Symmetry: C3
Subunit: 222 residues, 3 copies
């Protein structure tokens, strides 16, 4: 449309749609109960992202936020996506290593705090306070990355695949707070169309790329 | 009130209230842990519906949506109801057949997508796009109905009762997308007062009728 | 600020922050899987409350509701807090006594109804109807208190600690509907600044005080 960022929302829509169908077809035939879990979780993630990319594309998931005395376009639908997809991504890792339920609840809950405070920050009209919410959200993210690194007799296959996905996760997830900070939600150093591109690349890698690694491994089978 | 559809919201309120109290009293005394689950799930469903029918009745769960250059009355509270009650209904079926957790997560997640895209469609102001959301939601529903039919050594009692509830579910749930399509949320072929009547009949059958079948069966006991 | 109630939102923010860090440090080293669950649940509760107290403090979690022909300040963020923290509090009790899953689902669901109808009541613009929502919410609360009292061979340690926390819970939770009723959300008999103080004291006792009792007991260890 007249929104320069439309092309990246269109491409992301397409790529999440296509990954969803690919993982769907792939999980056809799986009867192993353990594998079943990894396919459900991993197929759902880009399915949800597909819907929220399309809602941004059609303009539904966009709102105007007054701050710095301007009307700032804020894509709120990203937070509806992440609210569900990031705990699912953490569940994939947690199941792989057979984490204790107490640790899974710590992780999902920290995650909810991360996304919910990011959303409040995105919609806050007092500019300086936006970054207070950014910092609390970032602290939640560092708690999560900590646990993925220092909170975990797995069969070798499990440990191998987990080490790769854990390294993927730390690198990609750590980039999101930076893009927000420099982008239209934060300091406004990078235009919205470039921000939208950055988040598209991170999202497709974190969802489809990550699932391609996981669903190709024997680590998911009993 | 001055809303011709009030009578059906009043009747639905009453019928969901009464079913909730009936199942409540009925589950008094049950000590079988397995039966306990079916009573909790099955009592909660019309309890939630009761509150959302009352919110429509009192006018709280109604908003105006501009589309086709008019102010269209949209009852959004239905989606708050269904967001919780339809996965619970699916949990009743899934527990009956002892489904794998991976399959339960596929089902609840597809369901969330179904209701959430229906809600976006209901609130979208660009008329043609309303039906794009309708179609994606419908695809999620067909995924769910598929799984209930081709994704499932149960004791005979389980298989019997499941076959009846599965047939009830496919027939009733399949009607909802049609009522939406022909009603005030969609093409506007049927007036709001008749739409509201249709949804009342489906809801009371899908919640109270369905629970009456289930809670009468020995299939729910270990 | 210019809001007389700010001081109590500031103190609550601080006290929830401090309890969160205290329980965090305390749970460092715990390896017992059962203890792990109680620490996760119990640390998360004031973590969430911290964020919602801060959102009230900064003004984000406040909205104006027209009723009785005035503009009534309503802190909606309390309901976002309670929606997650009160089922977690109930999960702490339920795990302690090893409740059946059917009973846990009854409890969490009744709780969701309690908070969600309280939220509708808080935002309803027709004054008399506010108290209809109050009454339904109160009925949900009485269902919950009933179950905590008449729905439950635990080792003595479990029974002891549970009896104390159950008595704490009944007394504190029962006060919330009274404060709402007499406060700015209800009859407007008590000013907002005094209401905010009352809820701060209840919240810090129900979250941090309650967790201090629980996390000090051996009841949480296998
Ligand atoms: C758990 C465990 C962890 C708990 C996390 C702690 C932090 C909780 C934060 C939450 C608070 C939510 C804030 C919010 C709901 C405020 C919305 O009002 C905005 C502010 O004026 C108005 O913007 C205009 C509109 C904006 C759009 C916001 C919509 C978003 C909705 C995304 C949610 C999804 C749910 C799917 C529903 C189907
Ligand atoms: C560790 C702590 C306890 C965590 C708490 C963090 C809270 C930080 C509060 C943010 C605040 C101090 C920054 C306020 C912006 C300030 C430089 C500019 C002052 O006024 C400006 C123009 O009058 C604001 O307009 C707008 C001009 C802009 C384009 C200014 C952009 C602001 C940027 C803020 C960047 C914060 C990241 C530095 C933090 C990295 C660590
Ligand atoms: C997409 C970004 C914008 C671009 C940044 C690309 C950097 C590439 C990351 C390399 C990392 C991958 C690790 C390779 C593997 C080796 C790790 O295995 C170790 C041995 O068991 C695990 O120990 C412990 C494992 C340690 C691994 C931690 C990885 C580091 C985390 C990187 C933080 C993020 C970067 C922030 C982006 C920037 C734009 C702000
Ligand atoms: C999971 C697994 C699956 C994830 C599903 C993928 C699709 C996600 C869609 C979600 C997005 C939610 C959209 C939304 C929150 C937008 C609201 O703004 C409206 C659009 O202008 C304004 O209408 C005016 C107001 C309208 C009213 C909307 C309110 C509704 C609230 C129902 C939710 C219930 C929660 C109970 C809270 C107590
Ligand atoms: C399988 C596909 C890939 C799935 C994707 C589906 C997307 C469908 C997009 C809907 C769109 C093509 C229909 C747009 C309405 C069109 C006939 C009328 C054109 O303009 C009208 C008046 O200028 C719109 O006003 C309003 C006049 C109205 C009363 C028109 C009502 C529209 C009706 C749409 C019905 C769609 C169901 C046919 C689909 C059943 C299959
Ligand atoms: C069938 C599958 C996807 C269908 C592909 C379509 C191709 C879109 O072509 C252009 C129509 O001029 C889209 O621009 C139209 C302007 C606007 C763009 C909105 C279209 C988007 C649709 C993306 C997929 C849709 C999904 C429909 C439901 C599906 C799951 C059955
Ligand atoms: C309420 C609606 C508006 C009115 C429509 C009423 C139609 C009555 C449905 C009959 C069906 C019940 C099946 C009877 C039983 C027999 C099935 O057992 C089979 C043997 O194990 C199961 O195999 C496989 C089982 C096969 C069963 C699939 C049932 C069909 C599903 C019907 C789709 C829906 C209709 C849409 C409504 C219309 C208004 C658009
Ligand atoms: C389950 C099991 C049990 C189901 C409970 C049954 C009762 C369901 C009730 C729910 C309905 C929600 C109502 C709502 C979403 C209506 C919002 O519109 C308001 C009314 O005009 C506008 O006020 C202006 C704005 C107001 C602010 C409301 C925001 C609140 C958000 C709190 C939710 C949190 C979620 C975290 C998201 C991150
Ligand atoms: C067990 C039942 C089935 C449960 C259902 C409960 C529904 C109760 C409906 C509330 C309604 C009858 C009270 C309406 C307020 C009424 C006294 C005042 C009439 O008009 C007033 C001024 O014209 C309203 O303005 C505002 C003046 C105010 C400051 C009046 C405050 C109202 C107070 C209501 C208190 C209700 C608690 C009594 C109930 C305790 C039991
Ligand atoms: C006691 C139980 C239900 C009480 C029945 C009441 C009967 C309503 O009579 C009319 C009052 O003139 C309702 O129209 C009044 C006009 C408006 C209608 C709103 C009333 C509705 C109330 C439906 C049930 C209420 C629930 C109260 C909480 C209950 C769970 C304790
Ligand atoms: C904070 C409020 C505003 C102030 C009210 C302070 C009252 C202090 C409550 C005392 C209670 C604590 C019980 C002590 C212990 C003994 C109980 O053990 C019993 C033997 O197994 C359990 O049987 C059965 C256990 C029975 C215990 C039920 C306790 C009662 C519940 C109190 C209802 C609430 C009060 C409402 C507050 C008022 C302001 C409206
Ligand atoms: C059959 C397999 C290989 C998957 C193909 C399904 C299609 C959709 C996504 C698959 C590709 C993505 C690889 C994961 C990692 C990346 C860093 C993706 C970032 C996007 C950049 C655009 C490059 C081209 C693409 C169209 C994939
Ligand atoms: C004790 C038993 C039989 C239950 C009675 C509790 C009351 C509430 C609901 C029970 C009746 C509903 C039967 C399920 C199926 C239906 C198709 C219901 C659709 C509604 C149509 C109105 C007909 C009359 C009613 C008042 C039940
Ligand atoms: C190390 C221990 C004792 C905990 C201290 C951590 C700090 C935060 C909360 C701890 C104190 C609260 C006790 C629980 C019960 C109460 C009734 C609290 C209500 C608040 C009243 C204010 C009194 C002083 C306070 C600053 C704690
Ligand atoms: C599918 C997408 C994923 C994996 C997205 C992850 C998003 C985050 C890790 C976002 C984190 C943020 C913060 C740490 C700071 C505040 C802003 C956020 C929400 C972008
Ligand atoms: C208690 C009520 C139940 C069982 C309701 C079920 C509702 C659905 C199956 C609704 C489905 C819809 C679609 C498939 C298309 C878009 C519109 C919806 C949300 C009505
Ligand atoms: C951390 C805070 C807790 C334990 C809060 C509990 C809040 C309740 C028990 C609130 C109950 C209410 C009703 C019973 C009636 C309507 C108003 C409410 C929501 C305050």
């Amino acid at each position: 449309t007249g929104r320069p960022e439309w092309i990246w929302l269109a491409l992301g829509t397409a790529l999440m749609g296509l990954g969803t169908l690919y993982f769907l077809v792939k999980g056809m035939g799986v009867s192993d109960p353990d594998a079943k879990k990894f396919y459900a979780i991993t197929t759902l993630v880009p399915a949800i992202a597909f819907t929220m990319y399309l809602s941004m594309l059609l303009g539904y998931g966009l709102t105007m936020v007054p701050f710095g005395g301007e009307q700032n376009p804020i894509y709120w639908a990203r937070y509806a996506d992440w609210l569900f997809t990031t705990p699912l991504l953490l569940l994939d890792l947690a199941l792989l290593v057979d984490a204790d339920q107490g640790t899974i609840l710590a992780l999902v809950g920290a995650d909810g705090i991360m996304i919910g405070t990011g959303l409040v920050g995105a919609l806050t009209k007092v500019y300086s306070y936006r970054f207070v919410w950014w910092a609390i959200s970032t602290a939640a993210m560092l708690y999560i990355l900590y646990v993925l690194f220092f909170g975990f007799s797995m069969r070798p296959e499990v440990a191998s695949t987990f080490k790769v996905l854990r390294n993927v996760t730390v690198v990609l997830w750590s980039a999101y707070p930076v893009v927000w900070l420099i982008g239209s939600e934060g300091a406004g150093i990078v235009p919205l169309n470039i921000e939208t591109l950055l988040f598209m690349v991170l999202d497709v890698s974190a969802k489809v790329g990550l699932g391609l690694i996981l669903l190709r491994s024997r680590a998911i089978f009993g």
